[PDB]
């Protein structure tokens, strides 16, 4: 009775970057769906082919959470509609994703005096991309002739560039935190039900 780890995803005091892609396979939860519906005013609560009103009466076997920080201009593309840099290189959803995508403004707590580090984004890795598969490989990308053999530098500056977030009440495309939720149903009993 009343045992759920949902509040371990929200309010983490440190959100993983898009390269980290902090998953959390959550099971055995029979309460605490109020932390999802009632919270700070959500910038986006775009759910998908699982009815958000009907979850309190439907039990799930696996509840997968995913958290990351992205720019407010890139609050889209968290959907089966693969489009954009973050979609084609960083993070992507399947065709029949059955879950909810929650996003909210994080400009109030991720404000930095200097910024331009601690968060990264990908430029070009089109040769490798799979849904629910993080590509944390960051050695080098192919350009010119030689991959600079890991001692890269001038004339082989092809590797990725990190985010330049430094909001000091001086940005409009503020950084937003996102908590993606997904569900699965297999040939196994469902353990994540609603409160009784």
């Amino acid at each position, epitope marked *: 009775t009343n045992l759920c780890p949902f509040h371990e995803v929200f309010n983490a005091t440190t959100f993983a970057s898009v390269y980290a892609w902090n998953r959390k396979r959550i099971s055995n939860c029979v309460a605490d769906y109020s932390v999802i519906y009632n919270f700070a005013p959500f910038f986006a609560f775009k759910c998908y082919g699982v*009815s958000p009103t009907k979850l309190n009466d439907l039990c799930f076997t696996n509840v997968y959470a995913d958290s990351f920080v992205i720019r407010g201009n890139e609050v889209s593309q968290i959907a089966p509609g693969q489009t954009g840099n973050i979609a084609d290189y960083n993070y992507k959803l399947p065709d029949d994703f059955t879950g909810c995508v929650i996003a909210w403004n994080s400009n109030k707590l991720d404000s930095k005096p200097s910024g331009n580090y601690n968060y990264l984004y990908r430029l070009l890795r089109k040769s490798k991309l799979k849904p629910f598969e993080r590509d944390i490989s960051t050695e080098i990308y192919q350009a010119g002739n030689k991959p600079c053999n890991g001692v890269a530098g001038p004339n082989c500056y092809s590797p990725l560039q990190s985010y330049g977030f430094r909001p000091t009440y001086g940005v409009g495309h503020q950084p937003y935190r996102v908590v993606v939720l997904s569900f699965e149903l297999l040939h196994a009993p469902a353990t994540v039900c609603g409160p009784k």
Partner: antibody, heavy 119, light 109 residues
Framework: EVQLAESGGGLVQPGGSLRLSCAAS????????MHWVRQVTGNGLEWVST???????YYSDSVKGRFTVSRENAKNALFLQINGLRAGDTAVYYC?????????????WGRGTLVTVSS | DIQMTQSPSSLSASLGDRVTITCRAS??????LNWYQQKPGKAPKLLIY???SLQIGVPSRFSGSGSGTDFTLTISSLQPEDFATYYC??????????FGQGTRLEIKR
């Protein structure tokens, strides 16, 4: 018969508040979800908002921020509260009931309360 | 954000004509598409839910079916009570449930 009513129709000043209601008949109002879908005069349908059985509220992109749906299981009446209307909101807010299933579908539409926003 | 671009509304036909109302979306919505029939003298009403399931009180000629991204609210034979506007709706995205622009069924002469 099983029909959805409506109220709150009438002329209103731009920016003034307004409340619409949606009475129930026959069916159980407390075990079915309710939705609001407005239709601009001569245009097509446009989804506005909805509140589920568990009291959870949902709104649209051009609706969230100033509208506030309200459900009271007593009197079997759905409610919708509006704040700060404008000219682009002149539409008939058809009340709708959500049927049982895994996806949202509207199986009972009300008569439709008309809202004309102008000074 | 998910678009629901429908076929051109200018689709005239007489009685009995096999009208085929086609409506597509921006991506796969599964079987969550559903139609709505609105005569411009009364309230809206649904025709097909789940894109394949006939509504109670709707005859068998309303054979609206489809799969994945393509749907056709086909009426093999019309009736004087069928001339109205028809709207498609997707339920894949639950909170932003979007509609189409519509299609008007008019009597041909």
């Amino acid at each position: 018969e099983v029909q959805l009513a409506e109220s709150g129709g009438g002329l209103v000043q731009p920016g003034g508040s307004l409340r619409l209601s949606c009475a129930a008949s026959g069916f159980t109002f407390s075990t079915y979800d309710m939705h609001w879908v407005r239709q601009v005069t001569g245009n097509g349908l446009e989804w506005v908002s909805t509140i589920g059985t568990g009291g959870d509220t949902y709104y649209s992109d051009s609706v969230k921020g100033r509208f506030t749906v309200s459900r009271e299981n007593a009197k079997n009446a759905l409610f919708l509260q509006i704040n700060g209307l404008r000219a682009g909101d002149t539409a008939v807010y058809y009340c709708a009931r959500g049927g049982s299933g895994q996806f949202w579908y509207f199986d009972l539409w009300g008569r439709g309360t008309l809202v004309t926003v102008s000074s | 954000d998910i678009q629901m671009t429908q076929s051109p509304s200018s689709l005239s036909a007489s009685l009995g004509d096999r009208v085929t109302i086609t409506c597509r979306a921006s991506q796969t919505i599964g079987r969550f598409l559903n139609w709505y029939q609105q005569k411009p003298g009364k309230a809206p009403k649904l025709l097909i839910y789940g894109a394949s399931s006939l509504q109670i009180g709707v005859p068998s000629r309303f054979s609206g079916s489809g799969s994945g991204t393509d749907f056709t609210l086909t009426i093999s034979s019309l009736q004087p009570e069928d001339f109205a506007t028809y709207y498609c709706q997707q339920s894949y995205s639950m909170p932003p449930v979007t509609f189409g622009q519509g299609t008007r069924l008019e009597i041909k002469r």
